[PDB]
Design goal:
Two copies of one chain form a homodimer. Chain A is built from two helices and five strands; from the N terminus they run E-E-H-H-E-E-E. The longest helix of chain A is centred in the middle third of the chain and has 13 residues. The first copy, chain A, is of the alpha+beta class. It is classed as fluorescent protein.
Chain lengths: ~100, ~110
């Protein structure tokens, strides 16, 4: 099953909700990730150019997909097929971001 | 600010998360709505045809936008500009639904 991460739209996009599969994949419990930016999933071998593409997409509230090297709580690397989409209201205000996380290792 | 409702994809789409604006708009605290289908927001003056359109869209996991009459916890009616989108993984599995709620009574 694919994980899901929901963040606030502003500040530094703190996590406000994760589903069960997020914990299955990453080894982190909800309580230890809520209020944090999801970048804690990154590590030494994470590709900087990929991170920059995510950074730009989020800044512009544009949908993006990347295959990015992430790390479980225990430090084991995994390949994360990550898809991020903005959540907008009818007036175009960005309410939140939703990320889908699939372990494609 | 617009409210947000996140539900599971299956088994009559129980609410798994709401943002603070949801509480401001509807008068319900998270604890009062988690694990329930959002249809408790509806009431007697809610348009049945609108509800039917939502029902069919959600069953097919299709995005839908409707203006629907809803009710706060205390029974006060309000017009809800509601936008629902499925969340899918790249294999096409529906992971969740996300609803945006805007009070457009005024
Ligand atoms: C909803 C959402 C989910 C995210 N999920 C992940 C993730 O699973 N793995 C990851 O490495 N980054 C993820 N990110 C990206 C980071 O949070 C961050 O935006 C990215 O590293 C670029 O910003 P930075 O250069 O400040 O790190 C997610 C971002 C958002 C908004
Ligand atoms: C994510 C999500 C959010 C929803 N938000 C609302 C809402 O704010 N107001 C509402 O009247 N119905 C809302 N619904 C629709 C009801 O939960 C339900 O799907 C609809 O009433 C049709 O089913 P029914 O005929 O069994 O009631 C939402 C559904 C989903 C999946």
């Amino acid at each position: 099953a694919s994980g899901m991460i929901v963040t606030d739209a502003g500040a530094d996009q703190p996590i406000v909700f994760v589903n069960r599969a997020f914990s299955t994949i990453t080894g982190y419990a909800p309580n230890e990730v809520l209020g944090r930016n999801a970048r804690f999933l990154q590590g030494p071998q994470t590709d900087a150019a990929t991170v920059a593409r995510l950074r730009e997409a989020i800044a512009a509230a544009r949908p993006i997909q990347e295959r990015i090297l992430n790390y479980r709580k225990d430090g084991q690397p995994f390949w994360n097929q990550l898809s991020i989409s903005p959540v907008r209201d009818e007036t175009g205000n960005v309410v939140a971001f939703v990320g889908v996380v699939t372990d494609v290792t």
